[PDB]
Every structure is written in structure tokens, then in C-alpha cells.
Homo-oligomer: A and B are copies of this chain.
Amino acid sequence: ISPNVLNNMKSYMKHSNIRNIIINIMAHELSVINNHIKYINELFYKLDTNHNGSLSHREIYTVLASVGIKKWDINRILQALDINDRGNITYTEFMAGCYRWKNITFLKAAFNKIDKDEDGYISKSDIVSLVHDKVLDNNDIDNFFLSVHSIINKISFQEFKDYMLSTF
């Protein structure tokens, strides 16, 4: 096992259950992202029929054609993808055109999930709810709020962001 993963675990073990629950929300979002990338990865592998790790115009053309994209569209896609005009398209270049960039921050999305009522503040009750399936109690929650504010018993996105960043 790589030392960086080992060191990550050792740092993780020192934080509170609530901090790490919050980390798990973000971890779910990485899993989702990574699933999309995996599909693109499998797509790339199928297009690369000579298995040379890059895509020619023809390799992409013949597949887009067989799936209903018309010549005029395929050619515009090809010239957008081939950003270096090399006649060979890299994994990174292919994936840039395949990935849905809409809604691309991890911390903001986690905060929004926690703020159940979308009022822009994380209340005590928002944390009670977050831990509804965990054996944690009111002592743990109070500690978390003190930690956040040691850097109104409510938390703005900025105070949320500032706390989480200080734990990395």
C-alpha cells in the first residue's frame, strides 16, 4: 500500500465522526463523478480498435455514424475534439468533450445537502438530521459547533468551508 494512502488513513482517524460523515457526503460525489469517467473510459477503449491509446478521426467517425450522428455533426465534433489539430485525439481530449460540465464545488454541494430547508445556514437540527442513522448524540453535536466557531449557533457556507479546510 502506498504511503500516501496510509498517511491519509492516519490523518482521517484523528477527526470527529461528524467531520468524517461530512467527508463521506463528498466521497459519494467522487464516486458519482468516477462512474461517469469509468463509462467514458470504457467508451474510449471500444473506439480505440488498434489499442494505441489514442483515437483517430476514422475510429470515432465509424462509431458515431453507426449510432445515428450525421456526417455534418460528426465533422464538427471531430474538429472540436482535435484541439491540437493532430489527427490523433488523446484520452484527455476525448473525455473533455464527453463529460457533462454543468454544475461542476464539493464543499458547496455537501453544505447544500446538509441544509435541508435551503435557508443558507446549517442549524443544530440540520446536524441532528445528518446523524439520524448514527449512534451519535447531543454531546457530539455541540462539540462540532464549537469546533466550527473556534476558527448564533448556526453555520454559514463560509464558516463551514473554513472549518473543513482547516481539517485537511
Contacts and interface: CB of A to CB of B under 8 A. Distances in A.
A105 interface: yes
Interface string A43-68: 10000000000000000000110010
Interface stretch (A29-37, A117-125, A139-147, A151-159): A29-37
A162 to B, nearest CB: 14
A138 interface: no
Contact of A83 (B81, B95, B134): B134
A113 to B, nearest CB: 14
Contacts of A79: 13
B101 A9 contact: no
Interface residues of A, number: 61
Contacts of A107: 104
A93 interface: yes
A135 to B, nearest CB: 6
Interface string A70-111: 000100110111011100000111011111111111110000
Interface of A: 1-2, 4-6, 8-10, 12-15, 17, 20-21, 23-24, 26-28, 30-31, 33-34, 37, 39-40, 43, 63-64, 67, 69, 73, 76-77, 79-81, 83-85, 91-93, 95-107, 133-135, 168
